[PDB]
C-alpha cells in the first residue's frame, strides 16, 4: 500500500500538464485565429486538432484512467464563462481544480452528471462566441469516451452527446451564416461527430431516420456555405448506402459534381475506394481498376495497422475480375498476412485454369469470403479465369487448335468451345480465325499497331495530363 | 374489420374482371393507410402483410394478363415492402417465385445490371440457401457456357413456378443469338450441325435465318462468304484525323507557353 | 557473336542481311527516368520530415 500509494499522486499532473495545454494553447490560440484570419479558415489549429484527437484516440483521450478520477470532463466544461481577457482566469481556475484531484478525495462527475454539464456553456450566460470550442467540449470528452463500448446506459449519453451537439448544430445553422469560417473549421468537427453518429448506431441499429437527417445537412450546405462539408456528408452516404441495399449505386450520378475540391487529401482517396466497390457491382472493370489503384497510391501515411491493410485487401478484388493479375503477396504485410491467407491462395488459383484447384479454394476458403460479401464475383470469375487461360495460350502461340486447347483448358467438348470463342470475339478478346470442318482453329499474328499509331496518340493524354499539373503547381504556388 | 379481402386469393380469378375488382377493393386500402409511412403500433402493418399476399398474386395475375407495366408495378411495391425500415414481417408464400418472375423476365430483356441488384434483398444467402434463387444464378452460368443445351436440360425440371411464360421469351433471346454469337467469325458450318442447337427437324426459323442472315444458303452446308467478313483494311482516311490530332496538340504546347 | 548481322529463311532458302534496327533515342530516355526515380524517393525524406 505505501509503495503504490505514493505512486498515485505523480501521474495525474501529466494530464494536468499536456492535456491542459492541449485545449489551453490550441483553444486559446484558435480563439484569436477564429476571431479574425479566419483565412481560409486556417485556423490551422482545426487541422492541429486532427493531430490531437486522433493522437488522443490512442492515448490519453480525456481518459484513461491514468490513475485519475476522470475529472477533466467537468473541469473545462464549467466556468467558460466567458468575457474579455478574464478568460485567463478560467484557465487559472482550471489550474485551481487540479489540486482538488490531488488533495481531497477525488470524485467522478462524468456520465450521469454530464447532462447539465453540456448545457453549462449555455447556462454560463453566455458562451458567448465559439460553438466549435463547446462542440469540442461536447465531443472530445464524450466521443473519445465512446471507445470504451460498455453498451450499458452510457450509449444514450453518447446519444445525449449527439443531442446537445445537435443543439450546437442549432447554433451552427442559426448563428453566423455570413463569412462564418467556423463552419469550415466545424466541417472537420461536424464530420467526426457525424461519423460517431454512424458508429454508435451500428452497435444498436442502423440508422433509418438519420438517412433522412443526412440529406438535411447534405442539401442545406448547397449552395450557401460548402467547403469540404458536403464531401464528408457524401462519404457518410456512400459508406453505409453501400453496405445496405438498394439503388444507391447509380445515385452517384445525380449527386456529382465531384464534389470539388477534394479534401482533405487522403480523405477523398478512400472515397474512390467506396465508389470503387460500387462500380465493381456495376460489372465495369476498367473504371474500377483505375479508381482502386488510385485509392492506394493516394492514401498516406498509416501506421497502424490493418485499417489501411484491410481496405487494400478488398481493393485488389477488382483485379481478380480484370483477368490480368500477378501474385498478390507483393502487397502482403506481416500483420495483414495472417488475415489474407484464405484470400491469398485464391488469386494463386486464378493464374491457373484448373477447375479442381479452383473449386477446392472456394470450399475451404469460402468461410473468409462470407465476411467480405464478395460472393457476387465467384460465379462470374469462372468466366474470367477461362479468359486468362486462353489469353495465356493465345499470346504464347500463333495458331491454337480447338481440340488441343480443349483438354488443355479442359473445356471437355468441341461444342462449348465454339460458344466460348464466339463470345471471345464478341468481347474483342481474341482475333483468331476458325476453320470449321471437324473443326479446328487457325489464327495468325496480329500486327500493324507499329509505332507511328499508338504511342503518339496515347501521348495526347500523357501531355494533357502533365500540362494540367503545371497549373496545379502554379495554383499551389499562389497561396503562399 | 373491413375485408372481405383474402377470400379471393385462394380461388384466384376466372377472368380479368375479378382482378380489377380486387384492385378496386385494394383502392380503399390505399386511401387510408396507403403504402407508407405508418410505423405504429406495428399492428397497423398487419393488413399490409394481408396487402402483400394479394399484391403477390397480383403479380401472378399480371403475368397472366401479360401486361408489362402492371407487372413491374406489383413487383416494385413488394420490393419496397421488404425494403421498408421495419424488417420484421411474417413469412408469405408467393414471395419466392415473384422475386424470380421479374428476375427471369429481366434476363429475357438482356439487362445484366438490374439482374444481380434484385437479388440484393438477400445477397449473402443466395448461394447458401433459397434454391428458387439458385436456379437463375445457375441458369445465367449456363448462358455463359453457352446454353442452348444445358438450359433446356434444366428446363425439364423447374418448380418453377410461373416461369413458363418467361422461358418462352428466354427462348427468343437465345434463339436470335445463334446467328449473332456463332459468327463472326467461322468459315463453314455443316447443315445438321446448326440443326443440333436449333433442335426441331427442319423449322422455318432456320429458313428465316437464310433470309435474315445473308450470309449464304449452301447445299448441305452454310458459308460465311465473302469473306469472314467484308475484309477490313480498315481505312487509309485516319491519316487525316492524325493531322487533326497534331492541331490541338501543338496548341497545348503553345498554351504553357 | 555480332560478327554477322542478318537473318535466314528456312523455307525458301534466302539469307537476308539487315543492319537496320538502331537503338539511339530510347535508352537515352527511359534510363534517365529510372535515375529520376531516385530524385523523388530521396526527396520524399525531405517532404515527410519538414511536414511532420
Amino acid at each position: 500500500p505505501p509503495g503504490g500509494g505514493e505512486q498515485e499522486p505523480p501521474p495525474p499532473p501529466a494530464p494536468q500538464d499536456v492535456e491542459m495545454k492541449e485545449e489551453a494553447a490550441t483553444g486559446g490560440g484558435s480563439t484569436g485565429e477564429a476571431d479574425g484570419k479566419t483565412a481560409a479558415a486556417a485556423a490551422e489549429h482545426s487541422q492541429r486538432e486532427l493531430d490531437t484527437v486522433t493522437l488522443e484516440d490512442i492515448k490519453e483521450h480525456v481518459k484513461q484512467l491514468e490513475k485519475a478520477v476522470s475529472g477533466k470532463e467537468p473541469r473545462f466544461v464549467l466556468r467558460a464563462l466567458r468575457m474579455l481577457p478574464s478568460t485567463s482566469r478560467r484557465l487559472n481556475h482550471y489550474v485551481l481544480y487540479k489540486a482538488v484531484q490531488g488533495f481531497f478525495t477525488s470524485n467522478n462527475a462524468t456520465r450521469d452528471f454530464l447532462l447539465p454539464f453540456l448545457e453549462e456553456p449555455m447556462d454560463t450566460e453566455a458562451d458567448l462566441q465559439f460553438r466549435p470550442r463547446t462542440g469540442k467540449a461536447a465531443s472530445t470528452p464524450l466521443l473519445p469516451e465512446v471507445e470504451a463500448y460498455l453498451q450499458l446506459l452510457v450509449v444514450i449519453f453518447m446519444m445525449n452527446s449527439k443531442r446537445y451537439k445537435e443543439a450546437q448544430k442549432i447554433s451552427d445553422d442559426l448563428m453566423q451564416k455570413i463569412s462564418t469560417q467556423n463552419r469550415r473549421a466545424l466541417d472537420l468537427v461536424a464530420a467526426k461527430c457525424y461519423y460517431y453518429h454512424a458508429r454508435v448506431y451500428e452497435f444498436l441499429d442502423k440508422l433509418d431516420v438519420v438517412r433522412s437527417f443526412l440529406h438535411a445537412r447534405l442539401r442545406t450546405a448547397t449552395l450557401r456555405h460548402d467547403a469540404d462539408g458536403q464531401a464528408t456528408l457524401l462519404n457518410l452516404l456512400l459508406r453505409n448506402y453501400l453496405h445496405y441495399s438498394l439503388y444507391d449505386q447509380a445515385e452517384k450520378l445525380v449527386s456529382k459534381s465531384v464534389f470539388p475540391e477534394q479534401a482533405n487529401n487522403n480523405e477523398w482517396a478512400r472515397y474512390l475506394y467506396y465508389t470503387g466497390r460500387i462500380k465493381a457491382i456495376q460489372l465495369e472493370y476498367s473504371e474500377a481498376r483505375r479508381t482502386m489503384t488510385n485509392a492506394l497510391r493516394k492514401a498516406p501515411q498509416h501506421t497502424a495497422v490493418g485499417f489501411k491493410q484491410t481496405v487494400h485487401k478488398l481493393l485488389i478484388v477488382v483485379e481478380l475480375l480484370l483477368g490480368e493479375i500477378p501474385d498478390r503477396l507483393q502487397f502482403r504485410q506481416p500483420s495483414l498476412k495472417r488475415s489474407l491467407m484464405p484470400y491469398f491462395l485464391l488469386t494463386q488459383a486464378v493464374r491457373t485454369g484448373n477447375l479442381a484447384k479452383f473449386n477446392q479454394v472456394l470450399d475451404q476458403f469460402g468461410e473468409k469470403f462470407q465476411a467480405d460479401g464478395t460472393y457476387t464475383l465467384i460465379i462470374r470469375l469462372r468466366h474470367n479465369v477461362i479468359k486468362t487461360g486462353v489469353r495465356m495460350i493465345s499470346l504464347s502461340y500463333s495458331r491454337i487448335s480447338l481440340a488441343d486447347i480443349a483438354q488443355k483448358l479442359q473445356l471437355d467438348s468441341p461444342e462449348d468451345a465454339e460458344f466460348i470463342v464466339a463470345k471471345a470475339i464478341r468481347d474483342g478478346v481474341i482475333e483468331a480465325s476458325i476453320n470449321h470442318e471437324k473443326g479446328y482453329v487457325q489464327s495468325k499474328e496480329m500486327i500493324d499497331i507499329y509505332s507511328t499509331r499508338e504511342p503518339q496518340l496515347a501521348f495526347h493524354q500523357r501531355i494533357s495530363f502533365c500540362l494540367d499539373i503545371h497549373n496545379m503547381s502554379v495554383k499551389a504556388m499562389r497561396f503562399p | 374489420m373491413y375485408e372481405q379481402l383474402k377470400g379471393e386469393w385462394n380461388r384466384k380469378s376466372p377472368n380479368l374482371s375479378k382482378c380489377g375488382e380486387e384492385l378496386g377493393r385494394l383502392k380503399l386500402v390505399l386511401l387510408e393507410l396507403n403504402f407508407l409511412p405508418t410505423t405504429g403500433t406495428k399492428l397497423t402493418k398487419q393488413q399490409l402483410i394481408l396487402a402483400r399476399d394479394i399484391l403477390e398474386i397480383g403479380a401472378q395475375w399480371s403475368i397472366l394478363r401479360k401486361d408489362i407495366p402492371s407487372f413491374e408495378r406489383y413487383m416494385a411495391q413488394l420490393k419496397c415492402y421488404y425494403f421498408d425500415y421495419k424488417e420484421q414481417l411474417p413469412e408469405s408464400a408467393y414471395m419466392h417465385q415473384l422475386l424470380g418472375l421479374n428476375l427471369l423476365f429481366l434476363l429475357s430483356q438482356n439487362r445484366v445490371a438490374e439482374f444481380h441488384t434484385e437479388l440484393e434483398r438477400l445477397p449473402a444467402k443466395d448461394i447458401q440457401t433459397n434454391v428458387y434463387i439458385k436456379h437463375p444464378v445457375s441458369l445465367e452460368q449456363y448462358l455463359m457456357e453457352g446454353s442452348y443445351n444445358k438450359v433446356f436440360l434444366a428446363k425439364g425440371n423447374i418448380p418453377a413456378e410461373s416461369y413458363t411464360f418467361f422461358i418462352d421469351i428466354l427462348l427468343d433471346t437465345i434463339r436470335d443469338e445463334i446467328a449473332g454469337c456463332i459468327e463472326k467469325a467461322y468459315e463453314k458450318i455443316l447443315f445438321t450441325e446448326a440443326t443440333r442447337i436449333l433442335f426441331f427437324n427442319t423449322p422455318k426459323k432456320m429458313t428465316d435465318y437464310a433470309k435474315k442472315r445473308g450470309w449464304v444458303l449452301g447445299p448441305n452446308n452454310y458459308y460465311s462468304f465473302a469473306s469472314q467478313q467484308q475484309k477490313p483494311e480498315d481505312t487509309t482516311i485516319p491519316s487525316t484525323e492524325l493531322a487533326k490530332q497534331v492541331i490541338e496538340y501543338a496548341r497545348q504546347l503553345e498554351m504553357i507557353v | 557473336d555480332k560478327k554477322f548481322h542478318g537473318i535466314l529463311d528456312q523455307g525458301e532458302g534466302v539469307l537476308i542481311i539487315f543492319d537496320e534496327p538502331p537503338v539511339d533515342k530510347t535508352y537515352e530516355a527511359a534510363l534517365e527516368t529510372i535515375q529520376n526515380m531516385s530524385k523523388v524517393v530521396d526527396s520524399l525524406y525531405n517532404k515527410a520530415k519538414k511536414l511532420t
Binding site: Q456, F459, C466, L467, I469, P480 | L253 | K50
Partner: peptide, 30 residues
C-alpha cells in the same frame, strides 16, 4: 515524340523544384 518526352522531364524540373523551394519558404516562415 520529343514534345512528349521534353514536356515530361521539363515538368519534373519545373514541378519538383517549385514545390521544394515553395514549402521551404512557406511553412518554415510560419
Amino acid at each position: 515524340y520529343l514534345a512528349s518526352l521534353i514536356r515530361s522531364v521539363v515538368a519534373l524540373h519545373n514541378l519538383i523544384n517549385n514545390k521544394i523551394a515553395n514549402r521551404d519558404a512557406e511553412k518554415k516562415e510560419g
